[PDB]
RNA sequence: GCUUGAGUCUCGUAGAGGGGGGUAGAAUUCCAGGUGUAGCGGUGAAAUGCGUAGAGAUCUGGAGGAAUACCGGUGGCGAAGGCGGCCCCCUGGACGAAGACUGACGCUCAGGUGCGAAAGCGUGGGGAGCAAACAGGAUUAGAUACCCUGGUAGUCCACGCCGUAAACGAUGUCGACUUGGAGGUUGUUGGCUUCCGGAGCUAACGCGUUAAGUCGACCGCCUGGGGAGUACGGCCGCAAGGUUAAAACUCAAAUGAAUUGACGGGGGCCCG
RNA sequence: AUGGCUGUCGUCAGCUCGUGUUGUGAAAUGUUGGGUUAAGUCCCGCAACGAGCGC
């Protein structure tokens, strides 16, 4: 209802999904979407391509406002890092700024074992 | 480590000369200085057993210097460790 | 990596610009190494893998160039 | 190196913030220990970033 | 007696050497909400699990613990075990320079004593993350596993105990001597260190001035494979166990290195 | 027990030897290597130099 021009795509690109939220600059949320709800699972839900219609079902979901142009935040190591932003440059936003906002451990906290397979 | 002044008093008082920095008596007079200043540190400092080790090498390079000069010379022994105040 | 797109910069060259500072900042290793726990025995072992074959490619390339095939 | 001259430090860190290798720049051995430890300084006195996030 | 071994003094140098006290930034988790809406998470594929009581995502603020990205290096320091953010306090050793000084004060060391990773044990704390055990979900002929979701000891701190590791360079310590080459690190020609290689040595593999070469001193240890580093006894330990350490019996081998094949759910390159 | 004859890998590009050299030795080298061919086919390099059976 209320026309936000301005926006932030986070983009949370994990190995398994990828979940593309607009928020306003201040980080309360407009609309969302993933991968993992839009038809596809399991080998397909990690794809670029699944990451792709993410992309534009969160662009359809946020047309109530009017968002002229898209910070861009982009977490994590998936197949969902660029194939969004490409997506959503082709949905029709002005992107005036790319970030990597991957959080590394300055040292921090144990990961997990090994997979032994 | 034993500072620049307080080696220099020892070195002059068991010494025959400030140059005398060689001889037993100023060598076990500056160990027995050291060990006697880290029973300190050792008080507080319990699990500082790297530091401990180089006390130890003091005790050990005392204990070898007062055995020479035991045999060498008698009379000077017992001066030394009536002035140190030490046992043996 | 945290571009600022310019006036009149084309989509391409900043996303080619933000892939190449991603790969820069090593951020995609980074987030590889720190996937899961390699004990030091383990590190210690690859470093020393790392160190031993970045050397042998000396010894075998500089005995290349004064080899005839 | 002078954790204070910042000019000087910014010659050895990275955009994102992190201390740039002896191998990248020609530094000697002696003088990356040194100029680690004034970035580490800097770092805590809020004169460098440690990241370009913040 | 002497000064060449060994040591003392003077000046300087590098260092994750040790002990104690502070503190910084990143991240994880949790809590409190703001925004927001149907998924999230996970795998080979799944499912368990979490989620409309509003998760996941995103923003703000708070709490708490643990570890210090980059620097970072066949880099450094330490007797070995080991030691890594930054700052202070206390403290050990090493190296170099140029003298002065002591005058063989040395080397090794059974027994003895000290230190000694991780796990473990005791008492009191602490507990984010990780995770033996355990639970559930899968996989499978079965699956007390590998994989997944969780998760308690423990991992952290103080103090005490334990005394072992492929505690390894599988190479005892000290000293002398004996062609070279390329590096690293640290001093003002020395110290430490990595790789290659000569003679020599070696069963071979290899080692090669940091020797596994050529010698000397002293110590430790071995005597076929098993039985067995076990039993019994002693000592040590809160316990777990450690340490010292047999015998009968049994076999004609066990073993090391290297060679030719074959084979690999090893690699590379090709063909039908 | 055999001779002869035959299948099979497969008409796949292999399999070997003399002499020399290397190794205490089993053995190795040649036959590997760079290119190339349907081919151990050929050229080039090479402690190998030649040779046979295959091709
Ligand atoms: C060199 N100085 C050390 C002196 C010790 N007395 C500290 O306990 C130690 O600190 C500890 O370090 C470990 C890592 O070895 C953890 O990091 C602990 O968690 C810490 O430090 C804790 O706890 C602290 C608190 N206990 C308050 O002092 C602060 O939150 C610190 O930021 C936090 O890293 C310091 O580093
Ligand atoms: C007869 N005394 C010397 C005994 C040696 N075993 C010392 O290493 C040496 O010590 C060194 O002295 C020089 C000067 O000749 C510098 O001062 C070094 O810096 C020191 O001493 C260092 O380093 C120490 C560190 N090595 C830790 O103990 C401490 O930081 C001291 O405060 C600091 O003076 C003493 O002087
Ligand atoms: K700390
Ligand atoms: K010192
Ligand atoms: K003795
Ligand atoms: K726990
Ligand atoms: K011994
Ligand atoms: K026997
Ligand atoms: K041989
Ligand atoms: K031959
Ligand atoms: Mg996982
Ligand atoms: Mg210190
Ligand atoms: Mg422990
Ligand atoms: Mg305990
Ligand atoms: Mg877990
Ligand atoms: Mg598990
Ligand atoms: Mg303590
Ligand atoms: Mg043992
Ligand atoms: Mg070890
Ligand atoms: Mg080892
Ligand atoms: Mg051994
Ligand atoms: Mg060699
Ligand atoms: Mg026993
Ligand atoms: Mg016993
Ligand atoms: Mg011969
Ligand atoms: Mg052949
Ligand atoms: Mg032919
Ligand atoms: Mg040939």
């Known amino acids: 209802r209320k026309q ?3 926006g932030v795509a986070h983009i949370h690109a994990s190995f398994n999904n990828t979940i593309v939220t607009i928020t306003d600059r ?3 949320a ?45 977490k994590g190591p998936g197949p969902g890092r660029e194939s969004t932003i490409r997506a959503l440059n082709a949905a029709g936003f002005r992107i005036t700024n790319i970030t990597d906002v991957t959080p590394i451990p300055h040292x921090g906290c144990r990961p997990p074992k090994k997979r032994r397979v | 480590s034993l500072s620049t002044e307080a ?14 920095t060689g001889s037993t008596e100023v060598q076990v007079a500056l160990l027995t200085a050291q060990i006697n200043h880290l029973q300190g540190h050792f008080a507080e400092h319990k699990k500082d057993h790297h530091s401990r080790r180089g006390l130890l090498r003091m005790v050990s390079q005392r204990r070898k210097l007062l055995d020479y000069l035991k045999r060498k010379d008698v ?7 009536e002035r140190l105040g030490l046992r043996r | 990596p945290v571009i600022k797109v310019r006036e009149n910069e084309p989509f391409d060259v900043a996303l080619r610009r933000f892939k190449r500072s991603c790969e820069k900042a090593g951020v995609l290793a980074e987030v590889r190494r720190r996937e899961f726990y390699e004990k030091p025995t383990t590190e210690r072992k690859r470093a020393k893998a790392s160190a031993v074959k970045r050397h042998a490619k ?12 | 190196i002078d954790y204070k001259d910042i000019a000087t430090l910014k010659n050895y860190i990275t955009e994102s913030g992190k201390i740039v290798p002896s191998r990248i720049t020609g530094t000697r051995a002696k003088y990356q220990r040194q100029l680690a430890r004034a970035i580490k300084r800097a770092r805590y006195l809020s004169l460098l970033p440690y ?4």
């Open chain 1, 4 to 6: 936000v021009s301005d």
């Open chain 1, 26 to 28: 201040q980080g309360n």
């Open chain 1, 30 to 74: 407009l609309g969302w979407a993933t991968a993992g709800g839009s038809g596809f699972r399991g080998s397909r839900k990690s794809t670029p391509f699944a990451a792709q219609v993410a992309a534009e079902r969160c662009a359809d979901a946020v047309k109530e406002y009017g968002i002229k142009n898209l910070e861009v935040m982009v």
């Open chain 2, 7 to 20: 080696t220099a008093k020892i070195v002059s008082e068991f010494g025959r000369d400030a140059n005398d």
């Open chain 2, 75 to 81: 009379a000077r022994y017992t001066q030394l460790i």
């Open chain 3, 58 to 69: 000396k010894l075998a390339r500089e005995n290349a160039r004064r080899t005839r095939l």
């Open chain 4, 51 to 54: 990241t370009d996030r913040h």
